[PDB]
């Protein structure tokens, strides 16, 4: 499969996506199967990020929680993970921007943040500064 196709496919298995982690499988068995693709698939993540309402912002989030989850059940250690552990706090900046938004989606953040934590993908310093980022955006 060429990065063509693969985006094109991914782009309409992101589409597909909501709050519920069943929703959140396909997507990321896809990108996990063509991990050859992962630049471009990582972007696609980013494409939708940024043209998406908060409520896709934050099922992308849940995804990405996903994503990761399964990398670690498939052995991975680089690659997806490293991207979102370099990303982390643009990611949350992104999902819980600075005003009501940040508010609206403040504990859905930090279940993800917690995830992501516990599981290794962030350490200590990288989960302290994007939990004070949510924190900061939820009080402004």
């Known amino acids: 499969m060429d990065p063509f ?3 094109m496919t991914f782009l309409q298995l992101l589409g597909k996506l909501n709050a519920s982690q069943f929703s ?4 990321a068995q896809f990108a996990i199967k063509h991990l050859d693709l992962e630049e ?10 940024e043209s998406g309402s908060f409520n896709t912002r934050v099922n992308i989030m849940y995804f990405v929680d996903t994503l990761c989850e399964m990398c670690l059940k498939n052995g991975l250690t680089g ?3 490293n991207m979102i552990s370099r990303d ?10 600075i005003g009501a938004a ?3 989606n403040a504990p859905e953040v930090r279940k993800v ?3 992501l934590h516990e599981k290794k993908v962030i350490d200590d310093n990288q989960y302290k500064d994007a ?5 900061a955006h939820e009080q402004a």
């Not at 471009?40 to 990020?49: G, K, M, N, V």
């Not at 982390?88 to 921007?97: D, E, F, R």
Request: charged share 20%; aromatic share 8%.
């Open 40 to 49: 471009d698939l990582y972007s696609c993540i980013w494409e939708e990020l």
């Open 113 to 115: 943040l917690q995830s």
């Open 88 to 97: 982390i706090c643009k990611l949350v900046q992104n999902v819980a921007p």
């Open 24 to 27: 959140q499988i396909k997507p």
């Open 102 to 104: 940040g508010a609206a």
């Open 5 to 7: 196709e693969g985006r």
């Open 131 to 135: 939990m004070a980022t949510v924190e």
């Open 79 to 81: 690659g997806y993970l």
